[PDB]
């Protein structure tokens, strides 16, 4: 009569690596590395993202005429740009501190777009219908939806001084522009005054702008330039615009609601009616594993990204059938 | 392995023992068959579960981490940002891979140890009532029925009740 001591063997082909040996075939093992995503953009805890599509952050906030579908949006979980998000500033120039503005928007969960200076009543002594072919819309010349190109009225551009008091209980993002004509004839034709100036002040912001007239290379068939500026108006604070030319006035502003965990990503994937806790530019992840090798850019609650191709932990025995 | 049982003095595994990591094969005249040691297998499962849970819990969740944008005059800051991202990625890839390797080695040694200790406790129970036949097997110097085999498995082998019979047959 005999009795023997032994160990398990099965049909498993799983292999792990150790420090002394590679490709040890073992009876049982567990994968710790997530490599499967759904290939879709999804809601984040039930809240859909904001898809900019053809537009980028600048075209969205300025109101590029190609981005009118984005005007009524109010809340989102994250922001998606695409490789084709090129409709931004249509009249050429510089968006000052644009990257800082994107970083600010990265923590905004919602906002209210509202009329800070109504078109029909804020500028009685100026013309408000200035448009350009650089920002065309359906064939016709047009302009940004949130700004207003103030021009001379009846051969005169009076000194203007308009103010707004933030009664929103929230930070108010205010954007404006400064126009720099290519020659002094256009400067006089548009604003009459050749030594123009713009001044924008709050309790903690204070800037003066001077037109810089010179002929530039043609960009979108414009030899002039337009610089875009922004500031955050604190609750209860007042913003004052003072000018005698070249001001691209604010018409709509944004009362911002801050949130946590949001961000801006670039993605080629498409929106589905899915929900997730973890979104990457390649797709959503649904996993309890500690590591993933899908993408370093993550939104929500995700596994840690690593460059590894395989993280397999042996749990059973060396398999010797 | 470190303890010389698995792929050692017990050269192969048992595909016929489907219900446990470690166990026994019995051969008496009532027949033959396998008997998984369910309690040692369960304690091993508890230990390995704690190990996997430890790796998973030390790697706490990765909250929102996205890229940043820099203008054309911010190349130094952009390169610093990517140095930071790439250094952290290097370190975490290294940590994950080598943790997995070292713990795999330790796990194989853990199973090796469990098999060696099971063999040793059976030997300690049997003493001279049985002979060592190599390959992890014992041969009784007496008759050992199914209840006697279960006595060996549960740690309740009665050495005196077979001492005389087996030293008769041992000669």
């Amino acid at each position: 009569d005999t009795i023997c001591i032994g160990y398990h063997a099965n049909n498993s082909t799983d292999t792990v690596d150790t420090v002394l040996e590679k490709n040890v075939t073992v009876t049982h093992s567990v994968n710790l590395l997530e490599d499967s995503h759904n290939g879709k953009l999804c809601r984040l805890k039930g809240i859909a993202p904001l898809q900019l599509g053809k537009c980028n952050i600048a075209g969205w906030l300025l109101g590029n005429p190609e981005c009118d579908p984005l005007l009524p949006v109010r809340s989102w979980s994250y922001i998606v740009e695409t490789p084709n998000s090129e409709n931004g500033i249509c009249y050429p120039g510089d968006f000052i501190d644009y990257e800082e503005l994107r970083e600010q928007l990265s923590s905004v969960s919602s906002f209210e777009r509202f009329e800070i200076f109504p078109k029909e009543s804020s500028w009685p002594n100026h013309n408000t219908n200035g448009v350009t072919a650089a920002c065309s819309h359906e064939g016709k010349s047009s302009f940004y939806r949130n700004l207003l190109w103030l021009t001379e009225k009846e051969g005169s551009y009076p000194k203007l001084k308009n103010s707004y008091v933030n009664k929103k209980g929230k930070e108010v993002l205010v954007l404006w522009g400064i126009h720099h004509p290519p020659n002094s004839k256009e400067q006089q034709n548009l604003y009459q005054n050749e030594n123009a100036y713009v001044s924008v002040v709050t309790s903690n912001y204070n800037r003066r702008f001077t037109p810089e007239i010179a002929e530039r290379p043609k960009v979108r068939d414009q030899a002039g330039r337009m610089n875009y500026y922004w500031t955050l108006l604190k609750p209860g604070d007042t913003i004052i615009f003072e000018a005698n030319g070249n001001l691209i006035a604010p018409m709509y502003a944004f009362a911002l609601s801050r949130g946590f965990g949001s961000g801006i990503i670039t993605s080629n994937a498409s929106m589905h009616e899915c929900n997730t806790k973890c979104q990457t530019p390649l797709g959503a992840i649904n996993s309890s594993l500690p590591y993933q090798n899908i993408h370093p850019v993550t939104i929500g609650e995700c596994p840690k990204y690593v460059r590894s191709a395989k993280l397999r932990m042996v749990t059973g025995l060396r398999n010797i059938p | 392995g470190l303890f010389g049982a698995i792929a050692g003095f017990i050269e192969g595994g048992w595909t016929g023992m489907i219900d446990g990591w470690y166990g026994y094969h019995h051969q008496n005249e009532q027949g033959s068959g396998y008997a998984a040691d369910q309690k040692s297998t369960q304690n091993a499962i508890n230990g390995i579960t704690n190990k996997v849970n430890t790796v998973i819990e030390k790697m706490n969740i990765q909250f929102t981490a996205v890229g940043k944008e820099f203008n054309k005059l911010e190349k130094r800051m952009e390169n610093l940002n990517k140095k930071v991202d790439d250094g952290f990625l290097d370190i975490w890839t290294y940590n994950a891979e080598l943790l997995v390797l070292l713990e795999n080695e330790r796990t194989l040694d853990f199973h090796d140890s469990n098999v060696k200790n099971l063999y040793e406790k059976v030997k300690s129970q049997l003493k001279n009532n049985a002979k060592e036949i190599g390959n992890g097997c014992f041969e009784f110097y007496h008759k050992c029925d199914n209840e006697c085999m279960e006595s060996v498995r549960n740690g309740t082998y009665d050495y005196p009740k077979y001492s005389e019979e087996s030293k008769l047959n041992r000669e």
């Binding site: 049982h28 749990t315 059973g316 | 489907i18 998984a36 369910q38 297998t41 390995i48 579960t49």
Partner: peptide, 19 residues
Amino acid sequence: XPVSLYEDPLGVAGGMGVY
């Protein structure tokens, strides 16, 4: 099938002892 020999919440022993 529906019955398991072991408590294995993480799936560490696969189908071993599973019936």
